[PDB]
């Protein structure tokens, strides 16, 4: 029974900074690859960033490299995504899912959680 719950998103003008969090339960968080995904209106779902089990490896898509930072806490089964220098394309409904992606940044696991809204505009 994989269950996830995201929070920490809101409305912030371009250039701002947000910090997303996610509590996980129902599976063994310590031995699983975790990822952040977002749902942009008009485009669909796309993979954003991912992190290995023991944080020995972190991956980011081209449009967020050096701008977003992913991290985890296996002790509390938490997953964090630090966003900064936000653009208009960063606007979307952010989820956290298990495993990575395939092809052109296309997530493996579809989000069953509610997600957290991130809106970027003046």
């Amino acid at each position: 029974q994989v269950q996830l719950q995201e929070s920490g998103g809101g409305l912030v003008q371009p250039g701002g900074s947000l910090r997303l969090s996610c509590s996980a339960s129902g599976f063994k968080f310590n031995d699983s690859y975790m990822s952040w995904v977002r749902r942009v209106p008009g485009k669909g779902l796309e993979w954003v960033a991912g992190i290995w089990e023991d944080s020995s490896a972190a991956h980011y898509r081209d449009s967020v490299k050096g701008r977003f930072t992913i991290s985890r806490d296996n002790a509390k089964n938490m997953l964090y995504l630090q966003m900064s220098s936000l653009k208009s394309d960063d606007t979307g409904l952010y989820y956290c899912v298990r495993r990575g992606y395939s092809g052109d940044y296309r997530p493996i696991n579809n989000p069953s959680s509610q997600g957290t809204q991130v809106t970027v505009s003046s």
Partner: protein
């Protein structure tokens, strides 16, 4: 053994793959989920362990077919392959690795988890079947034409984009058979046994069951299989589920007389399930008619099936 392969690291080209879990078991090969430690990209990894050259030579042609079918939006994408001798392998068997792109999973397992919602719309069936046929068409366009011979819903995958993709090509071939009266009875028996192995019992065509009718065993095999699939998507059940040879040879099946939901597909089913392969519609004729239906229904059949995509 092929169960201890999980949690290991495989090197293919510039990729370092971590074996995550088992996707499918086989008596010859297992399919695993493999993730790259440098990119985070996921793949599907089939691992064949056998000393039989028949199976080893078969998976080689399986690779060549995929490399040629590459680039198509309705066919799984080949990435890499590797050969491992009996000596380097731990199981004492020759090892072969087949690496493709990772999808959401099989179409079948998403369908049963959505039966709770109710019956499938005529549109969703139209989307699934069209994208299925567009993949078969791409196969029948190749030179020489590639025949799947193992078309079934279990071989249909739901991509991460939300589209249908074909996966297994172990039974695929470009060889056609043209039996006449110059054929001996034993040759007919020998050819039949060979083709029978690579086919699913209830999906076996009339021309491969009765080899004294001088029916050509070519690309029209896939058409008959598609007719079984379309029937299987509307009425959920297989037209020849019992697999009785007498029913397949004589082409005896029944369409639900009180159907009022999938009536549009009645003409296509009857036209694809013809006993004589010479009378069955070509893949182009099937696709063409599917496009007319989608136009009259205001539906883009190439668009992703979002209802199955958001299924968990």
């Amino acid at each position: 053994s092929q169960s201890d392969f999980v949690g290991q690291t495989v090197e293919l080209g510039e990729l370092r793959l971590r074996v995550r879990r088992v996707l499918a078991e086989g008596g010859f090969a297992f399919v695993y989920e493999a993730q790259d430690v440098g990119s985070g990209r996921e793949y599907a990894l089939k691992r064949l362990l056998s000393n039989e050259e028949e199976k080893n030579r078969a998976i080689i042609q399986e690779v060549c077919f995929m490399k040629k079918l590459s680039g198509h939006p309705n066919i799984v994408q080949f990435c890499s392959a590797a050969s491992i001798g009996k000596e380097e392998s731990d199981t004492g068997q020759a090892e072969f690795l087949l690496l493709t792109e990772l999808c959401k999973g099989q179409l079948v397992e998403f369908l049963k988890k959505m039966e709770s919602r109710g019956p499938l719309s005529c549109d969703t069936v139209l989307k699934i079947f069209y994208q299925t046929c567009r993949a078969v068409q791409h196969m029948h366009r190749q030179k020489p034409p590639i025949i799947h011979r193992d078309l079934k819903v279990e071989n249909l995958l739901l991509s991460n984009q939300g589209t249908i993709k074909l996966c297994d090509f172990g039974s695929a071939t470009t060889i056609s058979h043209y039996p006449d009266y110059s054929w001996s009875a034993q040759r007919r028996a020998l050819v039949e046994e060979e083709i029978t192995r690579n086919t699913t019992p209830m999906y076996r065509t009339p021309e491969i069951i009765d080899l004294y009718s001088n029916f050509p065993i070519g690309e029209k095999q896939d058409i008959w299989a598609l007719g079984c699939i379309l029937y299987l998507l509307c009425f959920r059940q297989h037209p020849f589920e019992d697999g009785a040879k007498l029913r397949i040879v004589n082409g005896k099946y029944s369409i639900p007389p009180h159907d009022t939901q999938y009536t549009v597909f009645h003409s296509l089913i009857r036209a694809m399930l013809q006993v004589n392969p010479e009378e069955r519609l070509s893949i182009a004729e099937v696709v063409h008619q599917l496009q007319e239906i989608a136009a009259a229904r205001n539906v883009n059949p190439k668009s992703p099936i979002t209802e199955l995509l958001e299924q968990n």
